[PDB]
Amino acid sequence: GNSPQEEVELKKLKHLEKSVEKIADQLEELNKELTGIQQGFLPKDLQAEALCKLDRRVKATIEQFMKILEEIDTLILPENFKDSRLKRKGLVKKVQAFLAECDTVEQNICQ
């Protein structure tokens, strides 16, 4: 059943999972800061300046997820590699929901 070969693939996707987790925490840090700025602590001209800074970081984050997707898309997983295929699919779908989270943010600020 379980092949030595599939451990190579599972290891690849584990390393990609951790990268996703690290971008996801940058995304976490974006909402935590957004909130504080989205509460009129400073004048509107400078609040906008903070929101644009925040927006450029949303863009970095989106671009990092995108590069993750491009790496996953180099994988060819045999139909028998059921564990790799399920972990690849989970990861893609997860990144995509983080990407939807990023779109919520940037369409809301620095327009």
Partner: protein
């Protein structure tokens, strides 16, 4: 120590002739070519891989293609038409073109040669980081069709970069020098240099006699490359997804990008194998896209475009007053020349002639420049 620099429109490459051998030098990222990219941000100026990596997050402030502007007037026909391909802004200033960007709090403009000198500095530094010493002597190549304003503004970009430009040498000449075509025995040779990259196609015919070079003609297409061949495969797979799923993906930017990135990679695979497989999970509305493409099908998608490369070639021969039998050497330069069908179309137009192609086609020009830089040093 002297280095040879290919200052390409999209990529640059640096080589050093040392220990009787050309060493093509990798940058800090381990890449033997470096993107001709400069990016202006909130806090930093990025050059090379760092600049091209953030192109999606900063399109209007990432400058590339400066080689297209260098040495030209703003009202140059070329300048106006290329400008329609660029997401950054180009401006007129006393008759000469300038690129325009927000370098943070300001809003700055650069002459194409200032951008080209940033790229040369990076190449200079790549060489110094590998050699572990100062690099100042360099040959820098230019296209055979470059005018006096174009060869000079290129030489000045070098100078500004702190380089001593020993010579400005033509790219086709440099490729010839790479294959030791100038070392040949007796009578005068006609060499066809067929240069096809990701973005430009250049045909040049030279004469070599007693090692002395002469440009006879130039031809090609300013906007032809592997970029165009990827698009034929992209449209093929968009049609396929519409067929199997009744779904139109082309307005999902992230899906089109995934697909395209996978397509240029499949394309490269197809240069050494006869089939390429693609698996993209959840490409559009959660639908997985598993597919493959044969080499013959890839060739078929691009049939007109490949065949069309032979037209510049015939124009070149006409303009040089030569018959295709009177070409003694054909040299392959540019990443796209790795495509078997292109090499076979060329192979057969010259009635089976045999091609010079053992030197990495992306690297041949820097390779010839490095040979010549050592000789000049």
């Amino acid at each position: 120590p002297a280095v040879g620099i290919d200052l390409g429109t999209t990529y640059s490459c640096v080589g050093v002739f040392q220990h009787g051998k050309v060493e093509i030098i990798a940058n800090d990222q381990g890449n033997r070519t470096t993107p001709s990219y400069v990016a202006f941000t909130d806090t930093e100026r990025l050059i090379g891989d760092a600049a091209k990596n953030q192109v999606a997050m900063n399109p209007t402030n990432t400058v590339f293609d400066a080689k297209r502007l260098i040495g030209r007037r703003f009202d140059d026909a070329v300048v106006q038409s290329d400008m329609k391909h660029w997401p950054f802004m180009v401006v007129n200033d006393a008759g000469r073109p300038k690129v325009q960007v927000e370098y943070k709090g300001e809003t700055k403009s650069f002459y194409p040669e200032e951008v080209s000198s940033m790229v040369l500095t990076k190449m200079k530094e790549i060489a110094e980081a590998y050699l572990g010493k100062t690099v100042t002597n360099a040959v820098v190549t230019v296209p055979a069709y470059f005018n006096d304003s174009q060869r000079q503004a290129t030489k000045d970009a070098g100078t500004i970069a702190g380089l001593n430009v020993l010579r400005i040498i033509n790219e086709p000449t440099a490729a010839a020098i790479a294959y030791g075509l100038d070392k040949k025995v007796g009578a005068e040779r006609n060499v066809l240099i067929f240069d096809l990259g990701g973005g430009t196609f250049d045909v040049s015919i030279l004469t070599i006699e007693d090692g002395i070079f002469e440009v006879k003609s130039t031809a090609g297409d300013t906007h032809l490359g592997g970029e165009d061949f990827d698009n034929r495969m992209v449209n093929h797979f968009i049609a396929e997804f519409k067929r199997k799923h009744k779904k139109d993906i082309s307005e999902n930017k992230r899906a089109v990008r995934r697909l395209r990135t996978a397509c240029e990679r499949a394309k490269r695979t197809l240069s050494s194998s006869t089939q390429a497989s693609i698996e993209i999970d959840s490409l559009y509305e959660g639908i997985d896209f598993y597919t493959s493409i044969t080499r013959a099908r890839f060739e078929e998608l691009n049939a007109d475009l490949f065949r069309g490369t032979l037209d510049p070639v015939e124009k070149a021969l006409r303009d040089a007053k030569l018959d295709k039998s009177q070409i003694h050497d054909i040299v392959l330069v540019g990443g796209s020349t790795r495509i078997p069908k292109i090499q076979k179309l060329l192979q057969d137009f010259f009635n089976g002639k045999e091609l010079n192609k053992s030197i990495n086609p992306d690297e041949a020009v820097a390779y010839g420049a490095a040979v010549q830089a050592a000789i000049l040093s």
